[PDB]
Predict the 3D structure of the following.
Amino acid sequence: IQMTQSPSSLSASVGDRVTITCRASQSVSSAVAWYQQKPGKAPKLLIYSASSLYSGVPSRFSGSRSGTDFTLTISSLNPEDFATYYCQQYKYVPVTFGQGTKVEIKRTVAAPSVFIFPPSDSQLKSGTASVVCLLNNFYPREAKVQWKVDNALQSGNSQESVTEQDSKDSTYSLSSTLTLSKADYEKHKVYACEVTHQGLSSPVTKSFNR
Amino acid sequence: QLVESGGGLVQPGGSLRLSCAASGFNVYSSSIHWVRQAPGKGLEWVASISSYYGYTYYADSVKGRFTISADTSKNTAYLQMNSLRAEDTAVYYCARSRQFWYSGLDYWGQGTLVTVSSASTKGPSVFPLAPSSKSTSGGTAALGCLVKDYFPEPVTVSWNSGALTSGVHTFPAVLQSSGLYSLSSVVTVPSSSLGTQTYICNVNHKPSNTKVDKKVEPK
Amino acid sequence: TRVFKKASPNGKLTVYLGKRDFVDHIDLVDPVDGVVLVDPEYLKERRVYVTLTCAFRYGREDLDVLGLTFRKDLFVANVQSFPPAPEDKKPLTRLQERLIKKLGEHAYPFTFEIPPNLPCSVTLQPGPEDTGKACGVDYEVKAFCAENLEEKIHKRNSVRLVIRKVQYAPERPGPQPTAETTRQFLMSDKPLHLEASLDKEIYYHGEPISVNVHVTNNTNKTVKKIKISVRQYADICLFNTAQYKCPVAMEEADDTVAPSSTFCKVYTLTPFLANNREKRGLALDGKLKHEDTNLASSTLLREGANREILGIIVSYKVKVKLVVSRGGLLGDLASSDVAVELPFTLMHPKPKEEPPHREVP
Amino acid sequence: IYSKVLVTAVYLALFVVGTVGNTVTAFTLARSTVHYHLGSLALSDLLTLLLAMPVELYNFIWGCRGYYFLRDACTYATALNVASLSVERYLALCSRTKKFISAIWLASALLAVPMLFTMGEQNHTATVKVVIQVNTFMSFIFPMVVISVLNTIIANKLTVMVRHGVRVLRAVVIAFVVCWLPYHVRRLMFCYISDEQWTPFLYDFYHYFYMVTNALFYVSSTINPILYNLVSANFRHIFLATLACLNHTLSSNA
């Protein structure tokens, strides 16, 4: 069985309806349960039997039922509801979970800072080059940062890590490391950053030089 | 209430043992399920010891690798992760679905992360991000620190000895290409604050106790 | 909400049931509602009937000695379905109210008021070699297309849906299973007091049983071992109450009581299917298929077995044994076996939604 | 003489095998009131086999008549119990158990008490011979008729449905009748044939026929438990293993 949640990400603020449709590969009858997992915590049962709401959880969560689709409406979307939701079936022994639907606060679009930092001198002494481009404060996320070092994409060799939503700003921040060698540092005559977030009208031009 | 233990480092092909301290529940009236969650990935079922019908179901991925048992006298559902491959690193959870009327996995355990790698404990780094006044077009500063070559996930990196706790963005520890971890940290400051009250990157590593605490300086 | 639709091999006959698990409230039972979608212009103008069998595939004899699958229908009801009955002035229930409008004018309901004093579905455990048609009471809603009741019930269109008359534990427990036995061993001293008791009258399936074995052995004899065993009294009423007691859980700890001494230790134990999977002939909860089910719940009915003509009356009790040393001379060959029996009902808790959710590979 | 001794030894080995099978059946029945009575009869017949098949071998090679009478009366009680169990099963198809088993043991002892004093080795006899013949005739009259009725009922009930169990029971009952009823008839004749024309040839022929029929009667006593256990193959197989150890219902919403 392969149960898939179509709404992978739900950027909705409080008071907005949040429907998370989860459609199974084949008919799993009414055996679907939904869990809410906070960042780095244990999942908490919300509904079972695809309709029955688990005891001890708010009534904001309501699960739908269909041939293979099992929506979960929230509507209220309290701050406690801002987590990742999984759909799980127990109608077959290979119990299959959903991909997960992170729910984040909707915020006004923000252009990424794209504050690229050149490689550390002490890092160069070690024998490697790591020029981290610290793009920060962008609500929509999904920033396609391109290294474009020496007019070369150098795809694959990029350590991009994006933090979770800010506690107050609700804005993501992503850093992409060059992950190069000391010899490659000399070859990379002109590094740059080409963050392409939705807030940015065009690609960024934060050149790092050498 | 469920409690579990047994997380740690295992070599590729080694063996680890995880257990659940089911408190207030019975192993016969409630099946015990072990659920895997890779770091940053969705949940994945591993095993389920009914212990009433005497059937211990297993995932397709971990089929014979696991040997989950159930010590009913101590109310524990012991699990054996054996032959742990590199891609088996994850956080393993314990769940207690009813033996009769399944009704989902209501009670959940804390979770014991089982990292499987051949890397040994390696010292972190205190590399300061090169900040330039010209690079920082706006008022925000680009000062930051780089902490690479860390073996275990927990690597504490404080800023200015806890003074600059409002404005410092510490990125999660990405997995280094070699096999170690790397968790950087960038803090914003005034554009003219390149020398005005320079912050200190108080990084303290957990496993090696490598408390560098090296102040970052502008280029 | 959800309905269970089974179709005939040809497809012309279809039966829409509501739930294949009917609770027995002792006093009354949940009526078997449902509808049957029958083709008017494609069934060759043949009336269709609905039959609720209560087949009892058990009785006397064992191991096919002189009896082999002696099916005795404890209760069979036939109602005309294709004809809209003679002046059918009865409620249609909410199940058949929405179903009839949904399917249209070609679907006709059928209701089966199950008798009160009739057995619950309790399938006897088949042997490892035994398979297919098992023993014990098994209900079935069977809709067939036959011009008269005796028309050989053509197998091509003879849809049969298996149901259960399951029963759930009461929501009000009363007395405590306290019962003591005394025996003047060899008429030597005051009789030993085996004042054993349980912890709760009703134990759900899988919940623990706290057997508080309390012994004051005043006689000269001392106990070699104390055994507390839980027995399943499967009283098959097809014969003259051919009760088949079967132990399902045993706790025989070698703890010994000295003469002129007291003893009190709770013998917590739990009955389950893993240790009793080997014991063939064991009464299990009714199975709609080859699915694994728990031990048969303690069968109860209105005023107990007020009119239990036939059927498996599964009842449970715990046997608080006391293996004592041989009276007088002890040759290591005989042992007095003082014991106490404490009744208890091992019945499922009352469910809210559809009973079974177990994973089906 | 040597051929007779060899045949007696072979029959003794077969009787030992049958006694082992009867002990296995009794162990199976240790853990079914009709089966409990059959197992008690099988244990009694195993004791009677240990007391008679060795006695049969000794007689072929050659108090003792008292032991033979005790064994034969225990086996008569066991055979009556087996025939009554078959008849009761047929009729059913058409604390109390323990008390009945104890009373059956007591009745078997009381019946065995009869022929000890009459039939015995002195180193008068007409009355002893008459009593032995009467007891054998009564035992044969009850067992032959009971077995015939049970076999006929079983054949009528089962063969019409086709059976294998009925046919096996009928064959075993025929063998057991041609063993016991011929044995009782031979005993009554040897105790009742007139001394006229009772030359050594007639006595030797009667002795040889009685020895063959006594081997067959021990075989039939061990086979009545074997015939009873032949229909419990699954349970018999489990007991032998233990001894050797030591369309589709869819759904559619409304």
